[PDB]
């Protein structure tokens, strides 16, 4: 299981921008990745699900990657 925060179990186009600040911290922490600059995703869930594959790479060189397939694994259910 993913372990998932409470708050975040609502549908990402709720999300706020302190949401995807926590959704930041939990796929850094849980999928152990490198270390994501939290002033690279200063938007809420509606501008999160815009962002392309590239646009998280531009974001985190180290981490975007695998951000977006996070989120595209909670997309999928």
């Given at each position: 299981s993913i372990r998932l925060p409470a708050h975040l179990?609502?549908?990402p186009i709720?999300?706020?921008r302190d949401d995807v600040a926590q959704?930041?911290?939990?796929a850094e922490n849980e999928?152990?990745?490198?270390?994501?600059?939290?002033?690279?995703?200063?938007?809420n869930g509606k501008d999160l699900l815009l962002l392309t594959k590239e646009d998280f790479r531009?974001?985190?060189?180290?981490?975007?990657d695998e951000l977006y397939?996070?989120?595209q694994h909670i997309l999928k259910q």
């Open positions: 179990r609502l549908q709720y999300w706020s959704w930041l911290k939990w999928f152990s990745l490198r270390p994501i600059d939290s002033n690279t995703f200063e938007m531009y974001r985190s060189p180290h981490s975007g397939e996070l989120l």
